[PDB]
Amino acid sequence: EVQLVETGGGLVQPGGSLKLSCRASGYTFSSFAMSWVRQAPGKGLEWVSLINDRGGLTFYVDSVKGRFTISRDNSKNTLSLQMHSLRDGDTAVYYCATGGMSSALQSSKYYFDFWGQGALVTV
Amino acid sequence: NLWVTVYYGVPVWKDAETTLFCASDHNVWATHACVPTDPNPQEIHLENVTEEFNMWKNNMVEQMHEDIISLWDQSLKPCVKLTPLCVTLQCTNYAPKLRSMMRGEIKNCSFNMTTELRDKKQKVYSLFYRLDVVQINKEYRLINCNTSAITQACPKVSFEPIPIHYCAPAGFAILKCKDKKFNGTGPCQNVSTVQCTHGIKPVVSTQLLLNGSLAEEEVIIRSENITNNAKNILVQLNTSVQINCTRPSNNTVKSIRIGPGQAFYYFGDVLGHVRMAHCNISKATWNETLGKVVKQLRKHFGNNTIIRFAQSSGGDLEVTTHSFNCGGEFFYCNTSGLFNSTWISDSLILPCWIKQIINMWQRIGQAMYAPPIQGVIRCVSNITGLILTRDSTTETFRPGGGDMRDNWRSELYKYKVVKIEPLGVAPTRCKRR
Amino acid sequence: IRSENITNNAKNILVQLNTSVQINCTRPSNNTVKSIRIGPGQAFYYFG
Amino acid sequence: NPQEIHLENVTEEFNMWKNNMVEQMHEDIISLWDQSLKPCVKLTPLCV
Amino acid sequence: GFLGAAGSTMGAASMTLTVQARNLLSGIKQLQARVLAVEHYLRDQQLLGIWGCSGKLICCTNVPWNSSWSNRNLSEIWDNMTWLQWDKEISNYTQIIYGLLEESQNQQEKNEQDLLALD
Amino acid sequence: GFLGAAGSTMGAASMTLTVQARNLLSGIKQLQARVLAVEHYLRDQQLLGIWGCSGKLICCTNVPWNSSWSNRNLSEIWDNMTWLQWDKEISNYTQIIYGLLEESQNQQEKNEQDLLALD
Amino acid sequence: GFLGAAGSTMGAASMTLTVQARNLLSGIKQLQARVLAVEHYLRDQQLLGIWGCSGKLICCTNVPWNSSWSNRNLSEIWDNMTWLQWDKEISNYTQIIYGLLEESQNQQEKNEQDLLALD
Ligand SMILES: *[C@@H]1O[C@H](CO)[C@@H](O[C@@H]2O[C@H](CO)[C@@H](O[C@@H]3O[C@H](CO)[C@@H](O)[C@H](O)[C@@H]3O)[C@H](O)[C@H]2NC(C)=O)[C@H](O)[C@H]1NC(C)=O
Ligand SMILES: *[C@@H]1O[C@H](CO)[C@@H](O[C@@H]2O[C@H](CO)[C@@H](O)[C@H](O)[C@H]2NC(C)=O)[C@H](O)[C@H]1NC(C)=O
Ligand SMILES: *[C@@H]1O[C@H](CO)[C@@H](O[C@@H]2O[C@H](CO)[C@@H](O)[C@H](O)[C@H]2NC(C)=O)[C@H](O)[C@H]1NC(C)=O
Ligand SMILES: *[C@@H]1O[C@H](CO)[C@@H](O[C@@H]2O[C@H](CO)[C@@H](O)[C@H](O)[C@H]2NC(C)=O)[C@H](O)[C@H]1NC(C)=O
Ligand SMILES: *[C@@H]1O[C@H](CO)[C@@H](O)[C@H](O)[C@H]1NC(C)=O
Ligand SMILES: *[C@@H]1O[C@H](CO)[C@@H](O)[C@H](O)[C@H]1NC(C)=O
Ligand SMILES: *[C@@H]1O[C@H](CO)[C@@H](O)[C@H](O)[C@H]1NC(C)=O
Ligand SMILES: *[C@@H]1O[C@H](CO)[C@@H](O)[C@H](O)[C@H]1NC(C)=O
Ligand SMILES: *[C@@H]1O[C@H](CO)[C@@H](O)[C@H](O)[C@H]1NC(C)=O
Ligand SMILES: *[C@@H]1O[C@H](CO)[C@@H](O)[C@H](O)[C@H]1NC(C)=O
Ligand SMILES: *[C@@H]1O[C@H](CO)[C@@H](O)[C@H](O)[C@H]1NC(C)=O
Ligand SMILES: *[C@@H]1O[C@H](CO)[C@@H](O)[C@H](O)[C@H]1NC(C)=O
Ligand SMILES: *[C@@H]1O[C@H](CO)[C@@H](O)[C@H](O)[C@H]1NC(C)=O
Ligand SMILES: *[C@@H]1O[C@H](CO)[C@@H](O)[C@H](O)[C@H]1NC(C)=O
Ligand SMILES: *[C@@H]1O[C@H](CO)[C@@H](O)[C@H](O)[C@H]1NC(C)=O
Ligand SMILES: *[C@@H]1O[C@H](CO)[C@@H](O)[C@H](O)[C@H]1NC(C)=O
Ligand SMILES: *[C@@H]1O[C@H](CO)[C@@H](O)[C@H](O)[C@H]1NC(C)=O
Ligand SMILES: *[C@@H]1O[C@H](CO)[C@@H](O)[C@H](O)[C@H]1NC(C)=O
Ligand SMILES: *[C@@H]1O[C@H](CO)[C@@H](O)[C@H](O)[C@H]1NC(C)=O
Ligand SMILES: *[C@@H]1O[C@H](CO)[C@@H](O)[C@H](O)[C@H]1NC(C)=O
Ligand SMILES: *[C@@H]1O[C@H](CO)[C@@H](O)[C@H](O)[C@H]1NC(C)=O
Ligand SMILES: *[C@@H]1O[C@H](CO)[C@@H](O)[C@H](O)[C@H]1NC(C)=O
Ligand SMILES: *[C@@H]1O[C@H](CO)[C@@H](O)[C@H](O)[C@H]1NC(C)=O
């Protein structure tokens, strides 16, 4: 019913930076909160970040709280994540997902409703 | 799992009755106490809003009527009182040998009155219209000396209607219908919000509605209860018919002093021939206007009925004739030449009478004397609506009228005033702290 | 019995009763009233 | 005892001929004048 | 525009509250009308103050929704209904809700007072 | 003293705000004057409320200074200028600043509402 | 009931503050009376605002009790005294207390401003 596609780079050096971006189609982008979830090549997946539908509020997992910036553009229907100081512990496939929050006047979620296929970021 | 959230500034309202304030962009209905209007009012269209209107329960009409009466009395208050005019008059007919329709209409009356000094009297000769003088040289009295005091209107204050805007006080809003073919009641689909109404001229007339607004597409027939013979029917035309009305006589006005700081103005002489006041209404335009009215009446009374128009059946001259004021003179036009027809499935001249003693607003006990106007009077007005009343196979309609509130309704039918209730509550997922 | 100053002869004493006493007061005459006009919009009423 | 507060380092621009206190003074004096004369004897009968 | 959102759904309409808030305040009869408008404004501000909402246009509280007042889904109330329809539905329970809000704020103020008393 | 700091620099003048705040509120024409004074007071309090400043005399906000409105140094504005000169300089941009303050508060209230929604 | 707690002790009486708060606001002479009632209401709300109490009925402050104003025990004041007796006792010191409250709030607002300045 919907499409969400990750764009991003590959191998970086430790201490550098990389911006990832996802494009959404098939649903109103501005009506849903968006999150980033990552899975290390040999581990399960974990939550990385959450942005509200308007984009004013952002939340991060502690392991990345001081480096990552999450931003969305509701006119372009895109979600961006700017990562800095990519560490070896940060190597993973990063998925964009629709869900994880609602703006007070909508039914609650606390789940990830739609998923993309994932950008693979290595160090 | 939901909690009450309090919202202030909710765009919700309820019907309310409040005091609206005049606004304007020397005149009887003008004052320095009336706030200037905005150079450009802001109208906010309300999409997907269907407000229910009722023009006959509108509290803006009573406010309009009361404020117009108040302005009227305020304008006449600082003027010359005519108490000394209630004297015995010795009168003869003016131009008693004249062949005309106006044979005996103007009487040449003589009276003593008084003057600046209380010990002396100044004999006065003046002309009065027959309708202002009642028999009691023959002895006559002014028609109003048996009913009320007469106050002279100030000659320096114009009676020309000036547009008056009504503006809601803060916390209230006025909803303007703007729908087409709106009969004055029920839901309106094109409702918009304004702070001030359009300018409404305080035009005073009976039987016919002059200088009003027009229907956008069709003649609109409005009645509180179309099946109740005790209610008036207000007809708003989509096109106007021009009425050119005049007092062709070249009247000369004279004045005398009647006390310290007081002067009395009266009708002195007629220059040239004495001519009858009258109105010019094009016959073809009027006939088409009534044809349109008849079609719209048939829509409510049946396609196969016969609609008849007839002259007013009786009552005071104010209701049996078309009363109006133009040029500073008060005309009472017969109109029997307009409302005389039966509808089954050159210009017209209406005789008019002029009166100087006017008893406006149906108030008995406060009379006003209209000073005569120097020269020849010609006025051109637009007839934009009609007032009709009705009495089987044939339905007969008559001019009716006389209740001034209905004239205000002819302009205020599209406005409603509401109170804003900015507080409201709604469930949300938000828990305090 | 209420008074601003009961010992001051210049003050009034107001006495509020616990029970009322009925007073039936009348003007037994059958008076006929007549009226005349004295000016425009004015009339004077008098005992006829 | 009115309290006057001196304003140091303030240079206000004045214009006595554009002062709206003058019109208020004039209108209020006229109003008081008419209010004082209103409840008094009229001399209309003196014009003899 | 003033009341431009009146026909808009509750969700979208809640984004323009400052327009109406600003417009609410902005002869003897006219002076009475102005005094009455001021009194009504102050009654609404006092009522918000009593509930602990004196400085907010969107004020969250601790009063639970009973669901008997209205059992509509949250998405139905905010995405499909207008504020006029909602007010028509809740007017029967408005005084109950206001009473609960006043009691809740009184309890909150006493609880904060006691927390502040702890040294 | 009332307005005693009017000729004083902005920094020192900001220490006496309560004197003017108290003084602002403390025939038919006089009654109209009193009603108008009340309406003006309420308009200023409502405007502070819209910005989320209903209970403060010195209220900090989230609106950045553009520097085009005035590019003076902070020490020049607070230590050398008076409030009258400052108002004369900013009056051309006052409505812009007020609009930004209203928008910022609306965004803040929506953000707080969403943070409160998180359980 | 309005003023029903007037003869009740201060402790129990403090639980009904919203009843009086709501009742305080709820010819030319009558219009003057209404305007005066509004002005008095606003003077009290302004005074609470100056002290930083604009949104509360029970507002805690940072001004210490001198004990010279009244040296009664806390249980004597709240469990044995009524609000009328207390007001009769404190009216001689009310202006002193109000002045201290205003100064304390001015100091608090400056301190919060400086804490907000730290980045
Ligand atoms: C309906 O509207 C028309 C047009 O606004 C009114 O006609 C106008 O009436 C006024 C007053 O009678 C005329 O003003 C007079 O003009 C003469 C010109 O010589 C002047 O000497 C007078 O002192 C006065 O200013 C105005 O000219 C006239 N307009 C036209 C085009 O004739 C009409 O009276 C209105 N109908 C009603 C019932 O009020
Ligand atoms: C009203 O009638 C009187 C006479 O009854 C008019 O006054 C007379 O006018 C003629 C000229 O037409 C004179 O010769 C007489 O001497 C006048 N008599 C008096 C007593 O004045 C008077 O002019 C008439 N009024 C008007 C307006 O024409
Ligand atoms: C009322 O209608 C008559 C015509 O029936 C108008 O009289 C004509 O007026 C024009 C223009 O002045 C003249 O050229 C014609 O010769 C007139 N005809 C006659 C028979 O007199 C009259 O002017 C109209 N009344 C008004 C006030 O306009
Ligand atoms: C006041 O007195 C006059 C007479 O001085 C009364 O009028 C007379 O009444 C008698 C009948 O009782 C008649 O026969 C006389 O002709 C009347 N005279 C006049 C001049 O009218 C008058 O009725 C008395 N008033 C009242 C109220 O009785
Ligand atoms: C005016 O008064 C005198 C008084 O002597 C009288 O003779 C005359 O007939 C009166 N005229 C009129 C018209 O009343
Ligand atoms: C005089 O006044 C009365 C009052 O009812 C009225 O009936 C009568 O018709 C009036 N006279 C004239 C001539 O109009
Ligand atoms: C409402 O009136 C305006 C007038 O300009 C018009 O443009 C609009 O189409 C009308 N709307 C409806 C639904 O009739
Ligand atoms: C007025 O209504 C009639 C009804 O038949 C119509 O023919 C005419 O065109 C309308 N005029 C306008 C200006 O709407
Ligand atoms: C006015 O029009 C409405 C349309 O719904 C109708 O219900 C009502 O009866 C009409 N009233 C009159 C007096 O024509
Ligand atoms: C109109 O008046 C008649 C009088 O008998 C009444 O029966 C009818 O119900 C009225 N119509 C309305 C709509 O009230
Ligand atoms: C009316 O008579 C006066 C007399 O001076 C004259 O000046 C004026 O032009 C006349 N007007 C008409 C319309 O005859
Ligand atoms: C009214 O005056 C105008 C002036 O041009 C004229 O064309 C029109 O025919 C007049 N009305 C009548 C009914 O004659
Ligand atoms: C109007 O003219 C007709 C002509 O028959 C007449 O009967 C009627 O009484 C006149 N109107 C008035 C008010 O006199
Ligand atoms: C009368 O209607 C015509 C229609 O074109 C208009 O031009 C004229 O201004 C109107 N006059 C008045 C007084 O409304
Ligand atoms: C009223 O009664 C009180 C009772 O304490 C008494 O002290 C006072 O003097 C009395 N006054 C009068 C006028 O009786
Ligand atoms: C009453 O008046 C007398 C007058 O001499 C005075 O001595 C007395 O003290 C007054 N009583 C009161 C209670 O004031
Ligand atoms: C007073 O006299 C009148 C005369 O018509 C009479 O009708 C009335 O009943 C009388 N009343 C008494 C109490 O005698
Ligand atoms: C009115 O309803 C339509 C339905 O799609 C909606 O698009 C429009 O925005 C609504 N009007 C307003 C002012 O929201
Ligand atoms: C909801 O309202 C009903 C009727 O007033 C009441 O019986 C019920 O206890 C209420 N429930 C809650 C949770 O307030
Ligand atoms: C006026 O300027 C002088 C300049 O040194 C300054 O000392 C003084 O305090 C200023 N006045 C006020 C009221 O601050
Ligand atoms: C400052 O104002 C100018 C002119 O209005 C505008 O172009 C610019 O974007 C503004 N900058 C900021 C940061 O608001
Ligand atoms: C009055 O005092 C008694 C003393 O025991 C107390 O019980 C009662 O509650 C008090 N009245 C009120 C209204 O508190
Ligand atoms: C208490 O008040 C007295 C008298 O005003 C004063 O001398 C003393 O310093 C005050 N103490 C405190 C702690 O404010």
Author numbering:
A (entry chain C): 1 to 52, 52A, 53 to 82, 82A, 82B, 82C, 83 to 100, 100A, ...
B (entry chain A): 33 to 57, 66 to 141, 150 to 184, 188 to 309, 312 to 323, 323A, 324 to 397, 412 to 457, ...
C (entry chain E): 272 to 309, 312 to 321
D (entry chain F): 80 to 127
E (entry chain B), F (entry chain I), G (entry chain G): 521 to 546, 572 to 664
What does the primary publication say about this deposited structure?
We produced a subset of Fabs with HCDR3s ≥ 20 aa that were not BG18 type I sequences and found that 7 of 8 showed detectable binding to the BG505_B23 trimer by SPR and 3 of 8 showed high-affinity binding (KD<100 nM). Thus, the BG18 type I and III Fabs structurally characterized here have clear potential to develop into BG18-like bnAbs. Furthermore, we provided evidence that N332-GT5 induced a wider range of non-human primate antibodies with a common BG18-like epitope footprint and binding orientation even in the absence of substantial sequence similarity to BG18, which suggests that N332-GT5 can prime a larger number of BG18-like lineages than originally anticipated.
N332-GT5 was designed to induce diverse human BG18-class type I precursors. We conclude that N332-GT5 consistently induced BG18-like type I B cell responses in RMs.
